[PDB]
Amino acid sequence: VPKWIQLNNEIMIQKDGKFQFDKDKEAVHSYFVDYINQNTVFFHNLKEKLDYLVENQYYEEEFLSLYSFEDIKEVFKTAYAKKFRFPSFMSAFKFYNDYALKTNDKKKILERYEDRISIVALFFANGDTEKAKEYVNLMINQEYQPSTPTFLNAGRKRRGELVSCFLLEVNDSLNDISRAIDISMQLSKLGGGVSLNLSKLRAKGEAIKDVENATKGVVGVMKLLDNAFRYADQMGQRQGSGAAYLNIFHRDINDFLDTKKISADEDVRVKTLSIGVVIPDKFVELAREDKAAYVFYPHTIYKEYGQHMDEMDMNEMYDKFVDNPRVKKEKINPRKLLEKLAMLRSESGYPYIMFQDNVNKVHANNHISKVKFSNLCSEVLQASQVSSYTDYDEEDEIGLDISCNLGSLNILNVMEHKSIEKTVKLATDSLTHVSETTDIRNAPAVRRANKAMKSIGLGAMNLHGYLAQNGIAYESPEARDFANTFFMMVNFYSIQRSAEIAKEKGETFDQYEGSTYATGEYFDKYVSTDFSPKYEKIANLFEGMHIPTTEDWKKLKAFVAEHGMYHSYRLCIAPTGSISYVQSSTASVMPIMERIEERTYGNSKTYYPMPGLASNNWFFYKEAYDMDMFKVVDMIATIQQHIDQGISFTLFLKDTMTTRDLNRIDLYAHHRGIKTIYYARTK
């Protein structure tokens, strides 16, 4: 075994009844000295390194040409002036195995952490030396973390897309379905995950040009999408991941769920296609009263009313559909469907549960469209318009398709530096640059919506790490108070930066005037309620930082009304997975699954304690499965009220908790305003 791995295994070797947590720093030192410093290509100067990387098609030349070499050298000096040291071996291992640039033969390492960060900052700044140095300070302090696509591929020629997600609306036509397959493959080859809304597709047994019982339902389209994502497997290095979302009132909802059953035959089962279920409040009401529900055939509704099933408010039109003889449906049991959802999530973790009315109750851009579906990570909730892809040599009607411009704030490092405002504004600027520089030619709706909506996703991570390292239990009301204050601050400064960008560019996002930002309805709870901490301990955490008040929110509302808002969406909390190791952070705002992660790499067993774990804060780092899921729902809903998009909310379930417990958690999440539920992780 290697020396660093052997030293890492001494974490679990307990002496005097305590874990040898100090051995981890020795593991980082051994790892670097024995592997990294030996297998990193070193050049006589930064000029030779840059020439080698651009000439050998490792870096793009366009973004480096915006700076003189003096500016680039100063930026790299700023990155290395911090003298950043990885505090855990797993952080360095993750970076130098996944995100560090390597030679074409993968034998050596071309990029350090201070090199990848410098290149990403130079990409973000776009010719500005001071902005590049600010980004370098932001990332080397680990206050803000660009998403895995953005961090990996910024300024590199051998890349994919910096966009993490692609949310595609699939219209009810063979041409539209074929274009959905094409766009799904063209966006999977770019690396980003693709989510598709299949609620517009007509159900099984529907008519294709007045011949009845002709359709095979959305399950055939899921088969096509699953094989399309399998084909676009990105070399197999990361398997093609795709999501499919269906409204729970869609007739195919039972067959949609039947594909995730283990007992399901290979003739119906889909493997690479994750599934999500969109649940309007009407379904929850029907389940609550234990009255028979109806799943409708979408094409009958489209023929009768001229509008798609998912474009109509089901809370208002459910009765109209039911008493309509020209609308086809079959009676179902909403409580039986809820139990089926609970057991499917217990067995496989699917489907993602999207509470449509919870999303659209506080959705700012309902005028553009209501949020009909979420992304593969079940955290992006944006307005989308379907695209009517017509026959060849006929002009297509291009709609709006959602894309992830993701970035995560490290709550621990953000609040240690007392720079919530600066970090949020710089992250918003970086995400704006990523959205602007994204130009996807094979996805027309994605490109059009990226140009028009200018939506970005600014998430946060290391919530549990910050709370445990500050002596706050995740389920404690003080933790919820801190999350309320912190995410209200994040929302305030994200809105402020969006309005500042709109003022400086003279343009807002498309159809901004109809949004609640323009009408001032979005800021109602912010100008009516004070989100300052209610606990003295929590208020001390924000000391040295100006917490926005009701009057400050009124000034921000006036500023937005006068100048507009550049981004339709700004905040969405992604799961923050493999990049959380590099930032030495807990994943997302979720609680930690295990105090010490047991990971297998090759023939070695590697251990990763969560950052800041020690004897004093051992019980503050409570495992997620040990937590009360209701209090985690409370925490997320406290965070959710300050996030305009959704949060990737994973349910951590014990083996002893039945499907009724999972359904209770789901219904409490719906009752508390949770927008989406990502996963049901059973231990």
């Binding site: 929850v284 389940a287 609550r288 234990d290 409580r335 809820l338 139990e339 057991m343 039945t658 499907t659 009724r660 417990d661 359904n663 209770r664 219904l667 409490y668 009752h671």
Partner: peptide, 12 residues
């Protein structure tokens, strides 16, 4: 298990 829902799981 596969414990069914009752009327009291829909109010909190």
């Amino acid at each position: 298990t596969v414990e069914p829902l009752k009327d009291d799981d829909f109010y909190f």
